[PDB]
Design a protein around this nucleic acid. Structure first.
Ligand SMILES: Nc1ncnc2c1ncn2[C@@H]1O[C@H](COP(=O)(O)OP(=O)(O)OP(O)(O)=S)[C@@H](O)[C@H]1O
Ligand SMILES: Nc1ncnc2c1ncn2[C@@H]1O[C@H](COP(=O)(O)OP(=O)(O)OP(O)(O)=S)[C@@H](O)[C@H]1O
Ligand SMILES: Nc1ncnc2c1ncn2[C@@H]1O[C@H](COP(=O)(O)OP(=O)(O)OP(O)(O)=S)[C@@H](O)[C@H]1O
Ligand SMILES: Nc1ncnc2c1ncn2[C@@H]1O[C@H](COP(=O)(O)OP(=O)(O)OP(O)(O)=S)[C@@H](O)[C@H]1O
Ligand SMILES: [Mg+2]
Ligand SMILES: [Mg+2]
Ligand SMILES: [Mg+2]
Ligand SMILES: [Mg+2]
Lengths: 399, 399, 397, 387, 82
DNA sequence: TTTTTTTTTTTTTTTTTTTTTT
DNA sequence: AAAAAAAAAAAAAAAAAAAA
């Protein structure tokens, strides 16, 4: 080795190969990078070995794959494969735990892709410690990193997780690999969310959602079924907003029902929405747009119980209230994003590009967004993007 | 050797070289200091080596740079460089991992600035045990502080972190080096913040905020939704406040809508503020300034959902309420800062100099502050700092 | 020799720095013949603090500053930032314990400051610079020098990655005083707190603010000053509250106005509105202020949360001054809990409170009379015992 | 058993098995600065009234100890100080005094220079301890040992000392506590677990005799609407005062503003008084507080709360030496309470003339003769007896 | 043990105390080869119960009573109250 | 024939990780 | 929010042991 000037452009471009799973490719950042290390953590049972077996089958159509498993015997893995089904043209399988015995086979198969079905179950013969020991994990991961960086092998490592929900072993492990994925999914849903917390080769904002099914993990193409309901005739008082949950844009319906107050102080009731925010929005509508609302009771709901924290919902909430009060329908493919100011201005929102992209992917026609958010934003040309400046403009255009 | 002197001693000055990233220069106390040690810690994948490759390029425009790394090969570094820039001042890469060859090549090329990358990923063949040993990093740190002082090389060091997020290694590491930086970001946010916990050459309070983007880190300059020209021109009931978001001042905007109640009682709906605080402020206004407000509803909001609960916002809240009740605008170039006492006094506030300086940087023309806070303040030339001591003074000056 | 109880003792000649917020932590001043240990996180400010101490003590006696971790140029550059060498002192930057022992015997300094015992070493043994044996022998040498020359020694000790002193636990036994210098990244105050001091109370902490011109002592941590009340401002009063161990001054403010619409609000901040409405009920029953038909609005100034029962008297006097439209004197302070019978009940730490009010230059403090039993009033403060709220209201207004 | 000498700190006796037995060792460990040397100087001075005492110190020269003694002020009849570290010289001074109560101010700062090790060496301290054992055995001297502690607290070589040591107890306290707790952990001659507690002061350590948190008796004159109740701070009984202000609802509607108590419990209590006693409280505001901010909320308070409310409504004073304990039922029955014996004994210790208690709870308890324990059945009976 | 296939069977030698209201809470008696754990509210009778049970089992067989938490003198002085 | 010494061992302290407990 | 289980390292008590 020698020091070199940066203009010694020995950099060959990374011809990263795509698997068939677009959800997997996107989290990785376009594809599997040769010579990368990917560490997949996640709770027991969540689907890590299923995911890796699927991608191993798909990659075996394009390159040689070696699947290495300490924790499971070859018959179990073949039983899962036949439950999933693939030609498995060049898919090698190797149940092993001794690092020298895997390294020897790696140096003859020359696998383009290597799966390590659990790092905590594979041991160096050098280190005396138990298979989950910190020193064992350190030595095995350093040897795998040598194999990867020397032979351009892409290595997928399954990591055991502590009861905290964070990867076990020395933090050196998270420092040394190139990509760290978590695989997780709460019991309220069937969906399994794959997310990158580190990715030296791509954006860590991309997340992939799978559903676990008999016969494998299948991609879910719409994360949010809860909007899907085609509207009744009439159906006044509904609007749709591209809100946000964690990092993924999710599109959700807001509904309102405005009715004349009787025999009490006018009272306002919500679900999934802060009633303070709704009271503000109703005050803005009554002031700036002249909707008589201090004599109306109002009821607001988000479909599917998705809780709408962020201020970007306020414009869609106002449009829902207006649609109910006017008793006139919005279009089922109009979508609304923006904070509503008490001076009636529509205020810019973060992540505007992702929201417009997601609205385009779900096939909406018109998305209304704050005019000042549009600066330098490139729209997808298939969806009409309307920049709006004040609530009176939105009401006059929608109604 | 055998010194021993009175305090009359050479007092040699410290020169500084600024990077082009003012957000980075700020944290170091105004620029890189020759012969200093700066230690960078932070979560895996946070952006440390992008930041250091950016600053490595900028220093490379004004001096020779040697970038060592044991983490990554020269090809990966060059691919990153192409991703984030034009290679407009080429510098040296060295993929070395053993300290003797580093010391050799650094003595031969004799750089102005040196970057180690991770101190935990370099070892010394003369001593001790495993990579990342406490025994190893201590001795490498001693070698670096020597090489630094013998040559006046400024050295930047990446440090691993524990799972708790504190710097790894023996505390001798955190004592021998001169500057210790943390690079961090909460998962609910897009920003990365860079903060000093120790800095022998400047204040630690100055943090720097970056956004991660496809072309690298970019300094945000404005951590807030307050973009001045957002204001709806004819807007009334809005005012801006300089608020401490922890250690950093941020702009925030307080909006009020004030309107007569059409019921036997009046609402006090408030988002982002304590409604008891707003109710106290309206009682101060009604008693001292004579605004008839018990007949009026008030609705109050903070822009962008920022939670504003420090006493310094009371003045801007009072001015927003008064602006709405009077239906007169305020100039969007004025900031307000001050606690409001039930006497109508504007009480002094903490960190007043930071607040004035940050109001100055984003180009505000006036800021109203407690007059008693003005003592010893270095107030910048570009902004007229208007001392005030009663709410009625503010209302006469502004309305 | 067992000299029984006949040995003769002379009072320690406690010298003082100008930083009273430092002197308080040592329990009144710097004793001679003594070891002080300063611990704290890296970067906290220990060297800045001991530089300022050196420069101040140099006005009283000879100071020698030694530092194995920092060159004399860096120390002089810091001193030039902090101020000027008008009180010039000796600076050695030595690492050899034998050399500093010889130099101390030559110069006979009144005060010695060692900025890292983790870098002094003696050649009689060798090893890692911070080795337990090296620090133990060096600190034994320092215990000799302290006794032999009556020298006050300030030692900077390193700290582990938890907030505890490194090196042998025997260290905290040999030394006479142990200080931790501590702070929090969300803040910018530094607290200096003792964990051991056999020459004086360890119930006192010093507070500092790190600034460009050094560690400024924060004599008054509250945003509460006698200079800043509006001349005729009614409806506020001062109370000596306690933040754990530290007496903290606080102002309570009250706005009383007729309840023109609806029914009586009791909107409150920093206080508790149940406490406040109790106090208004006591005033209305016992003192006769017609406060039922009044709205009342109360806040702590400065956003300090007030919990303890000692605030009741100050809150009552703030309400009463707001109702009566008669200002309280800004230099009078109130402490005491209010009973629903209108009695004023005893409070804890009464002496530490009166001492803090005296030290902050309050001309007068009101206290529950029965708490005066066995009390030791300072000279610079007038202390008034009161028995009932009627007595207070007659005396104040 | 063999006889016990008592120090004047009865708190110290009770943790030390009821008193220091002669001819045996005691080791007090604890964090530096906790107060070991102050405690042992007070103990040694109190024992000086019984016989000769020697205090040996390496870690503190005689002048500093004398300064501390003159701070505390206690008279020091035949109190010996000895600044020494040569253990053989200590042993010889033992025979030049023949003490009766010996103190070593730290085992880690005395050395027999011939034998072994450095002053910290486990062998050196163990062997010094083995010599001390012979000196204890020979002259029946009770020897108090100060222990250093490990960073963890484990007495800096615990096992080999502790088996020779007989009795070990730990002196400790937290960063903010004015109190320091002296916990006995092993003891051949008394309750193997106990906790002594002291407050540290500039006058020296002072016992916490009676509970830590009682603060009372600031009663004024004709203070209607006040009553006293015995309540538990877990296992400690404490004696606390309830105050009530009852006043007509001149404006608005009846408030129930309450602090310390639960306003639901208080609402039940005023409903019970309204129905069973016939107090017209529904048109009254009633304001209730526990004195001193004590979180006084356990079922046994309801009788005292009822008597405070009734005293305030009637505007007649409760006697300042009457105490009440009792749960109140919605039928006006007064129900049993958890630990009535301990409450009556605390009431007696604080010198209360009466305690009112639930009848059906006097069965099988030994009423102390100094206090008039009164059984009451019903709230109407209580209000007849008191008012 | 080494060889079994549902064979050797000493059965439960269930040994009573004189208090049947103790025996009834177990299987009608104590069981050899077993650990019984007793908890309870502190000082309420927890040790009094087991000391008395010892004074009743001592009639049937040898009982060794070990206390880390109380002195042998105070133990025997309490037992004398029985 | 004691004196290093040096392995072996204890054991303590620092530090990092992780299983319980609100 | 709190503890206890492994890893790494230094301090040290001890002895196999070869010297000086
Ligand atoms: N018919 C089915 N047959 C087998 N597995 C199924 C079936 N249906 C669902 N599964 C799911 O398959 C999951 C098993 O997880 P896998 O993908 O096989 O491996 P893994 O548990 O993620 O990896 P580890 O290291 O063994 S914890 C379980 O959570 C089951 O819910
Ligand atoms: N298009 C993008 N391409 C590459 N990286 C991206 C991209 N967008 C964001 N990144 C971020 O780049 C981060 C990697 O930053 P790095 O500086 O290379 O790693 P580091 O952990 O900070 O430092 P080391 O010592 O190299 S591990 C990832 O965590 C991503 O979040
Ligand atoms: N203009 C400024 N220039 C230099 N330092 C400043 C400045 N302003 C504030 N500082 C503070 O100075 C602090 C440094 O404190 P130090 O005096 O180095 O304490 P120390 O770390 O204990 O000293 P040692 O013994 O050398 S490690 C930094 O943490 C800064 O917060
Ligand atoms: N006016 C006061 N004067 C002197 N000491 C005080 C005073 N007030 C409190 N103290 C306390 O007295 C303590 C002094 O420590 P000691 O009473 O000597 O116990 P000790 O430190 O354990 O003794 P050893 O065995 O030498 S370590 C300190 O912790 C102080 O907090
Ligand atoms: Mg598996
Ligand atoms: Mg890197
Ligand atoms: Mg220093
Ligand atoms: Mg002592």
């Amino acid at each position: 080795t020698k020091p070199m000037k940066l203009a010694e452009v020995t950099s060959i471009n990374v011809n990263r190969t795509k698997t068939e799973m677009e959800e997997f490719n996107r989290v990785l950042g376009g594809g599997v990078v040769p010579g990368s290390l990917v560490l997949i953590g996640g709770d027991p049972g969540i689907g890590k070995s299923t995911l890796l077996l699927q991608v191993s089958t798909q990659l075996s159509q394009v390159g040689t794959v070696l699947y290495v498993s300490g924790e499971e015997s070859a018959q179990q893995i073949k039983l899962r494969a036949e439950r999933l089904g693939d030609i498995d043209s060049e898919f090698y399988l190797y149940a092993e735990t001794n690092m020298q015995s895997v390294r020897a086979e790696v140096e003859r198969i020359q696998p383009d892709f290597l799966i390590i079905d659990s790092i905590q179950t594979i041991m160096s013969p050098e280190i005396s410690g138990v298979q989950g020991s910190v020193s064992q994990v350190r030595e095995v991961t350093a040897e795998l990193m040598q194999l990867a960086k020397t032979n351009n092998i892409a290595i997928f490592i399954v990591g055991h997780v502590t009861k905290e929900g964070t990867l076990a072993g020395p933090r050196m492990l998270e420092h040394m690999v190139d990509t760290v994925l978590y695989f997780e999914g709460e019991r309220h849903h069937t969906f399994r969310i794959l997310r990158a917390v580190k990715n030296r080769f791509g954006s860590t904002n991309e997340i992939g959602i799978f559903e676990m099914q008999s016969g494998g993990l299948v991609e879910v193409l719409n994360p949010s079924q809860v909007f899907l309901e085609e509207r009744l005739d009439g159906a006044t008082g509904s609007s749709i907003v591209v809100t946000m949950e964690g990092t993924r844009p999710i599109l959700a319906e807001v509904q309102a029902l405005v009715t004349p107050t009787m025999f009490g102080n006018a009272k306002r009731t919500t679900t999934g929405l802060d009633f303070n925010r709704a009271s503000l929005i109703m005050a803005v509508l009554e002031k700036r747009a002249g909707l008589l609302l201090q004599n109306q009771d109002a009821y607001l709901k988000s479909a599917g119980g998705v809780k709408l924290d962020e201020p970007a919902i306020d414009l869609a909430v106002a449009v829902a209230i207006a649609s109910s009060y006017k008793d006139k329908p919005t279009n089922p493919q109009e979508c609304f994003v923006g904070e509503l100011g008490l001076t009636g201005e529509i205020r810019r929102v973060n992540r505007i590009e992702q929201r417009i992209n997601e609205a385009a992917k779900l096939g909406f026609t018109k998305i209304y967004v704050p005019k000042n958010s549009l600066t330098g934003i490139t729209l997808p040309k298939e969806i009409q993007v309307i920049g709006v400046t004040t609530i009176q403009e939105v009401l006059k255009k929608v109604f």
